[PDB]
Design a protein around this nucleic acid. Structure first.
Lengths: 87, 1364
RNA sequence: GGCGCAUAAAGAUGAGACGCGUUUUAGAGCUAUGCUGUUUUGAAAAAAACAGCAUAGCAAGUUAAAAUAAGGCUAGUCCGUUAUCAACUUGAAAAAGUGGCACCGAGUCGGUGCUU
């Protein structure tokens, strides 16, 4: 678990991630672009829960929600639920 | 109209603001371009600029290297075809054409489907006689018979494309290839690195232990068992275990912050170790290099095992024996499966989707997934021995082409090629007449210093051509001027110092630079001999004596070696309080010990004349890597060295770069002195100074001396000046966009130049905000203090690191349960009303560190003064605090803060320090920004060279505006909306211009330029309060923000009350209107129109997603080549839309296919962009659109703002979706109530606003329902997420009686539902409300396009619905 | 903000080479059952499958060739994912040019007056 955990390994799967955030702009909205499209995905950082824990806490499950366009993406994230926990 | 400008520089935004004298923000009605009803918009002249960050140039460098290496590879294939052109044409004509069309379908192919041998028969017998190519390879080395031409070509054609690393140099012999000499090379590196704790590895046999197959982790403790002892987690132990292939941690090995895991097989190593290096220092990287080299030796002994018929058969027999173990092990394994389980036989062998056999071979999987899959299942099997040894030995089922092929030295392919050429020299004489060309092709290697083979057409290369023909590896020396091109490589690869331009910096391991840094550590040494009570900085007699003794003796010198081997051995002193160095030296003459170990001539190294000779040797051993130009460059020094050490000197290397140049150190001098920087480091009088004071000696010449070089010569434009900088690319993009916003900004206001330009900038941090990255450090301070004391406080109260951040409990654990001021015991449970007082109070420096704050019972235990703490306390407590000194509970700075009562009170030097900590701007790139903005604005010279500096460049620091903001409660929640940046720049202008109003007398410290040198040696009064309207002094109190207040509380409850409306004494003009400034500025920050501009972009970058997908038949795939079907060959998917074109045309409607006038959005790939610029209308008719109307072609880039009803602003994400644009106007009392609601437990101050702000939080429960009202009736106008809205309103109605703090926290998390850009998820209390976006695009056709200027002050409104 | 020892550090940058990985094809699948196809003896079924198909059971199963951002022209054993950018006005580009002021109030800016 780290930030470049998620950067490097989600980088290793064939997506693009290029976050943007530093002092004093205390926001670290990373961008995902689950399609190479205007369907980018985003998670912030706020005061209580780091973005790793926001990520795994936001993706313990599969894809089961509304949109029928992103589901394989969630399946990809399903794999990266389990790698960093047991390395 | 007098005015001034406030700015703020981050990495995604720049805040811009315009202020007047009374700080009223201006506002202007503006001209509207387009075709609307409104023709003027009143806008406030304040806002910010949003934009995506500026990425580095790394990925383009990597893909450039990949294209070049595939280019050279394929051209090597073309070379080998060129040699075997005719004779292969002699036998079978279309053979190479069969190799060219190996990739097509038999429909698309125009020859036989069998490439090799044409027929079916010799192909089937080819695979049966030779299953792999390695059988053919070992056949051809061990043969006497003739062979087929296309067969031999296919053999050596395999032997070119895969040649292994050139990273070894020379040939295969135990000097560079065996495990014994390289292992003992590691041993000499280890014991010769430490010089303490010498280990032995003489009688051990690492060849027998490491070479033979076993379990790796079982082998791991065995070499530990043959050495006497380090640990199973020893540094040598984890080092050699790292060298085997296990990936250990190195957290506790060096006592670092995080874990330090490294995988040599992973591609992260080549910089992750570097980030490890930055946490240990550069002295260890050679030891890690030896670890990598010995790991390569272990891998080489792993791949080569056969030694029976070793005559020219090193590799292929090992490969085919591995093939056979795969074969018979597969047969016996399958027999064990069907023998034991008739279930899961299909799940192993017919699956290719569950990490089984068929996934490891035919499917998509890897060896980790396969072994981790089979290992419990094969563990379950009844009778199965002697296969787990292959499991831990990685031996079962292992293929040929693996990732362990990166170990192979190219000499094996070389000689293995060569013996085939020896057995084939007789039969086919073309080979006999081309064999030197063949080995020349395989052994070719483009050096570092040469670079690419351009013809002046590159942007990157520098080759000069001594002859003019095709650059070919037969005759590579016939073209290259290595002297001129390599001379350019000297010039193209050096860096220029910012601190001294027009000059080349030194290498990192220069003798001159190491003298600089060893002297730069010895310049801080201020020792107390026992009996003078004086920490005296050293003399050049002393320093020169120690360098004559110790630094020419060993590298790592400790303080006991220091004071023992010098102060008692030479100077006969027992205990010397050497205050500077704690234990060890940050600098050492390691290169001195290197070359002195090599050539063994101390007279040669102590010569003042061989120094530049060693600069040549340091320079060549720094730069070049190809050994030929290594050695010829020192044939100039063929005289000095009699070739013995030159058998060794060509091997040794050095990487790095010095931060300085020789002309900055041993170049210029003080004209008053006639002394170099080396001369000052050897003679600085009684006051020996660090080099940061040698630059910043404002009395001395060196700031002027550097600064006369810091100004440019013939200056370029803006763009190259920004290219000259030093930082991230993104911060440079912030600089350029800052300059553009200043340019349009001064074009707005009457084309009148401004007066004051304030700059704030601080960024680039990744230190994880110090929530848990600090409790281990200060907890480690607790473990060091309790470690030295023994008074075990951690036996009766252990506490937790979630509650270690709060300063009360931590200060309680610091002082060993004993108060500083009164000699008493601070009780455990009464810490609530225990007081936290400062060493120096809140009128002289705003400090919240450990260095100032101490814990006590009462404020009156200190004394009775706002001055230093009372001498009835420090003289009283000179014993226990000296126990805090001896146990290192305090640093020397905090020691002299506490023992400032020895100095009586606050001196001129004291307030000199406290004033010169608030304001001294100490970032290099900030001063460069001040120079670049300085050059453009002030340009009126006079008859002299004098810049008539009309425009002041004011630079502030974040502590001043930040603590002003926190004190006067104009709070800042970073998560409400993006307006806060513009308010930050506004307050930057407030504090900066307030400083230029109140104190013009010391502008020369926070404004770049040359103002008066009148400073606080007289601007500080030597006594109490100066008289009213007659004060030549600045003030008494070192805070510069006091006159904004009403009460200046002293250390006695005393209200030092400063006048209400502040003026300046020398001017008689008002500077602070306290009666209306806070209602004025508070009215400014609550304004509902703040200019937000997300900057447009043209999307560049890669073409698409890169992972090549199998051959389906979905119609959305992009073909790899133009002759390739996306169906019948597969291809890429998901292209990158650069920008969306907006087109009016007619589609063919219905089955009748009739012209239907439509106006619809169309996305453009990057792969079609230059086609679109070359002819757009033929591109769109190629797309299937007729009656193009070119004047209505509307280029819409990414983030192009559109407007809908009720001002529903939305940003154009791409052609496929939208993003959300409108913002939030929130009253400032709501912002403050959410701030202190969020900050209730972390209020961090006096109990007056703890209780006051606490009850004030307890007042306004109404504000919460007002905020949910604002989001409610706001969100129904622009968001339109109805079910989400009912979920959060109902969920809000559920938990209304929550505890207040975390409830307000969930409100802050609820604010993400409004924000700008991408739709996000969030979690109110437990119910995580799902995100929802707008994939639609049909509404944008009926909307209001707005084009924006870069400050958003010339809007251009275009209506699409008015268009046909 | 971390002032993290009152100090303040360290920065973009570009050249060489391996090893993968991915994709398509070559790596003849064998037997039994059932089906579509032409033969065959045929006034019609009727095997000869030479084929294709599907379903079962068997059999092996490691490697090679090609490409690895579309491609471009300046044709090099070079280059193509960096930085750079509203609009309209010219100008090939390079570039340059394009828009009143005070006052009142504030829900995304609005209103009033003057100058024109």
């Amino acid at each position: 678990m780290n930030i470049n955990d998620l950067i490097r390994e989600i980088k290793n799967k064939d997506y693009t991630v290029k976050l943007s955030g530093t002092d004093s702009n205390s926001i670290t909205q990373l961008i995902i672009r689950v399609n190479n499209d205007g369907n980018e995905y985003v998670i912030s950082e706020s005061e209580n829960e780091s973005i790793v824990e926001k990520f795994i806490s936001a993706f313990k499950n599969g894809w089961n929600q509304e949109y029928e366009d992103e589901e394989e993406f969630y399946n990809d994230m399903q794999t990266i639920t389990l790698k960093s926990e047991l390395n | 109209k007098k005015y001034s400008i406030g700015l703020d520089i981050g990495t995604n935004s720049v805040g811009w603001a315009v202020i007047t004298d009374d700080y009223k923000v201006p506002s202007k009605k503006f001209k509207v371009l387009g075709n609307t009803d409104r023709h003027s918009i009143k806008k406030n002249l304040i806002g910010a600029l949003l934009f995506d960050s500026g990425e580095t140039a790394e990925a383009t460098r990597l893909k450039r290297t990949a294209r070049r290496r595939y280019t050279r590879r394929k051209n090597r294939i073309c070379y080998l075809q060129e040699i075997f052109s005719n004779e292969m044409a002699k036998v079978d004509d279309s053979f190479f054409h069969r190799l060219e069309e190996s990739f097509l379908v038999e429909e698309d192919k125009k020859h036989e489907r069998h490439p090799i041998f044409g027929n079916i028969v010799d192909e089937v017998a080819y695979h049966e006689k030779y299953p792999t190519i390695y059988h053919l390879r070992k056949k051809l080395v061990d043969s006497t018979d003739k062979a087929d031409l296309r067969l031999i070509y296919l053999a050596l054609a395999h032997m070119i494309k895969f040649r292994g690393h050139f990273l070894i140099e020379g040939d295969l012999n135990p000097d560079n290839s065996d495990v014994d000499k390289l292992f003992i090379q590691l041993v000499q590196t280890y014991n010769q690195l430490f010089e303490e704790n010498p280990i032995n590895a003489s009688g051990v046999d690492a060849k027998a232990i490491l070479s033979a197959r076993l379990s790796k982790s079982r082998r791991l403790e065995n070499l530990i068992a043959q050495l006497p002892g380090e640990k199973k987690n020893g540094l040598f132990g984890n080092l050699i275990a790292l060298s085997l292939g296990l990936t250990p941690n190195f957290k506790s090995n060096f006592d670092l912050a995080e874990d330090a895991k490294l995988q040599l097989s992973k591609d992260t190593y080549d910089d992750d170790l570097d980030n490890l290096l930055a946490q240990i220092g550069d002295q260890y990287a050679d030891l890690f290099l030896a670890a990598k080299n010995l790991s390569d030796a272990i891998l080489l002994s792993d791949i080569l095992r056969v030694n029976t018929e070793i005559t020219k058969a090193p590799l292929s027999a090992s490969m085919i024996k591995r093939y056979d173990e795969h074969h018979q092990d597969l047969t016996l394994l399958k027999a064990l499966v069907r023998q034991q389980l008739p279930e899961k036989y299909k799940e192993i062998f017919f699956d290719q989707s569950k990490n089984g056999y068929a996934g490891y071979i035919d499917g998509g999987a890897s060896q980790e997934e396969f072994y981790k899959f089979i290992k419990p299942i094969l563990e379950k099997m009844d009778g199965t021995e002697e296969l787990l040894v292959k499991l831990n030995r990685e031996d079962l089922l292992r293929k040929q082409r693996t990732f362990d092929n990166g170990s192979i030295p190219h000499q094996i392919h070389l000689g293995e090629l060569h013996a085939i050429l020896r057995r084939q020299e007789d039969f086919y004489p073309f080979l006999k007449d081309n064999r030197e060309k063949i080995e020349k092709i395989l052994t070719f290697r483009i050096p570092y210093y040469v670079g690419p083979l351009a013809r002046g057409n590159s942007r990157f290369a520098w080759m000069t051509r001594k002859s003019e023909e095709t650059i070919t590896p037969w005759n590579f020396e016939e073209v290259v001027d290595k002297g001129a091109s390599a001379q350019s490589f000297i010039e193209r690869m050096t860096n220029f110092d910012k601190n001294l331009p027009n000059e080349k910096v030194l290498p990192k391991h220069s003798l001159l630079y190491e003298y600089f840094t060893v002297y730069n550590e010895l310049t801080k040494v201020k020792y107390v001999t026992e009996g003078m009570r004086k920490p005296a900085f050293l003399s050049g007699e002393q320093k020169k004596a120690i360098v004559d003794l110790l630094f020419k003796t060993n590298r790592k010198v400790t303080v006991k070696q220091l004071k023992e081997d010098y102060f008692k051995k030479i100077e006969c002193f027992d205990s010397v309080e050497i205050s500077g160095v704690e234990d060890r030296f940050n600098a050492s003459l390691g290169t001195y010990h290197d070359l002195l170990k090599i050539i063994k001539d101390k007279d040669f190294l102590d010569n003042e004349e061989n120094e530049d000779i060693l600069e040549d040797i340091v320079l060549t051993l720094t730069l070049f890597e190809d050994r030929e130009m290594i050695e010829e460059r020192l044939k100039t020094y063929a005289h000095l060295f009699d070739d013995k050490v030159m058998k060794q000197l060509k091997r040794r290397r050095y990487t790095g770069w010095g931060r300085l140049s020789r002309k900055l150190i041993n170049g210029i001098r003080d004209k008053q002195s006639g002394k170099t920087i080396l001369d000052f480091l050897k003679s600085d009088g009684f006051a020996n100074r660090n080099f940061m004071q040698l630059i910043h000696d404002d009395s001395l010449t060196f700031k002027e001396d550097i600064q006369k070089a810091q100004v440019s010569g013939q200056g370029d434009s803006l763009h190259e000046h920004i290219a000259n900088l030093a930082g991230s690319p993104a911060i440079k993009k912030g600089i350029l966009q800052t300059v553009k916003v200043v340019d349009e900004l001064v074009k707005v206001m009457g084309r009148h130049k401004p007066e004051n330009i304030v700059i704030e900038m601080a960024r680039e941090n990744q230190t994880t905000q110090k929530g848990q990255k600090n409790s281990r450090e200060r907890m480690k301070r607790i473990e060091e203090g309790i470690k030295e004391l023994g008074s075990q406080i951690l036996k009766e109260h252990p506490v937790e690191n979630t509650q270690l951040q709060n300063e009360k409990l931590y200060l309680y654990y610091l002082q060993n349960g004993r108060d500083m001021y009164v000699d008493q015991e601070l009780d455990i449970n009464r810490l609530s009303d225990y007081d936290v007082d400062h060493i120096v109070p809140q009128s002289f420096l705003k400090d919240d560190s450990i260095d100032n704050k101490v814990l006590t019972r009462s404020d009156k235990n200190r004394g009775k003064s706002d001055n230093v703490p009372s001498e009835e306390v420090v003289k009283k407590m000179k014993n226990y605090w000296r126990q805090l000194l001896n146990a290192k509970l305090i640093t020397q700075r905090k020691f002299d803060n506490l023992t400032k009562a020895e100095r009586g009170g606050l001196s001129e030097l004291d307030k000199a320090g406290f004033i010169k900590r608030q304001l001294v701007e100490t970032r290099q790139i900030t001063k460069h920004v001040a120079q670049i903005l300085d050059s453009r604005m002030n340009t009126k010279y006079d008859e002299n060279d004098k810049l008539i500096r009309e425009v002041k460049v004011i630079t502030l620091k974040s502590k001043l505006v930040s603590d002003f903001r926190k004190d006067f409660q104009f709070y800042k929640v970073r998560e409400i909306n993006n307006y806060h940046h513009a308010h930050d720049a506004y307050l930057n202008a407030v504090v900066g211009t307030a400083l230029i109003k109140k104190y013009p007398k010391l502008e020369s410290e926070f404004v770049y330029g040359d103002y008066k040198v009148y400073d606080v040696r007289k601007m500080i009064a030597k006594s109490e309060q100066e008289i009213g309207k007659a004060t030549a002094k600045y003030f008494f109190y070192s805070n510069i923000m006091n006159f904004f207040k009403t009460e200046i509380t002293l250390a006695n409850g005393e209200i030092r009350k400063r006048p209400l409306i502040e003026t300046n004494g020398e001017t008689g003009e008002i500077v602070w209107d306290k009666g209306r400034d806070f209602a004025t500025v508070r009215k400014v920050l609550s304004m509902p129109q703040v200019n937000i501009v997300k900057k447009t972009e043209v999307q560049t970058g890669g073409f698409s997603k890169e992972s090549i997908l199998p051959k389906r038949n979905s119609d959305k795939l992009i073909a790899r080549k133009k002759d390739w079907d996306p169906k019948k060959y597969g291809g890429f998917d998901s292209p990158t839309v650069a920008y969306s074109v907006l087109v009016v045309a007619k589609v063919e409607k219905g089955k009748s296919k009739k012209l239907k006038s439509v106006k619809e959005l169309l996305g453009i790939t990057i792969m079609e962009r230059s086609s679109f610029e070359k002819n757009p209308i033929d591109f769109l008719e190629a797309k299937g659109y007729k009656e193009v109307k070119k004047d209505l072609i509307i280029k819409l880039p990414k983030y192009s703002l559109f407007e809908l009803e009720n001002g529903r602003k939305r940003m154009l994400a791409s052609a496929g979706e939208l993003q959300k644009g409108n913002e939030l106007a929130l009253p400032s009392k709501y912002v403050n109530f959410l701030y202190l609601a969020s900050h209730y437990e972390k209020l961090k101050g006096s109990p007056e606003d703890n209780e006051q702000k606490q009850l004030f939080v307890e007042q306004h429960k109404h504000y919460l329902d007002e905020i949910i009202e604002q989001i409610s009736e706001f969100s129904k106008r622009v968001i339109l997420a109805d079910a989400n809205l009912d979920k959060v309103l109902s969920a809000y109605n559920k938990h209304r009686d929550k505890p207040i703090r975390e409830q307000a926290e969930n409100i802050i998390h609820l604010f993400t539902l409004t924000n700008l850009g991408a739709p996000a998820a969030f979690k109110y209390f437990d119910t995580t409300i799902d995100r929802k976006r707008y994939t639609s695009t049909k509404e944008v056709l009926d909307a209001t396009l707005i084009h924006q200027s870069i400050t958003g002050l010339y809007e251009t409104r275009i209506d699409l619905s008015q268009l046909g």
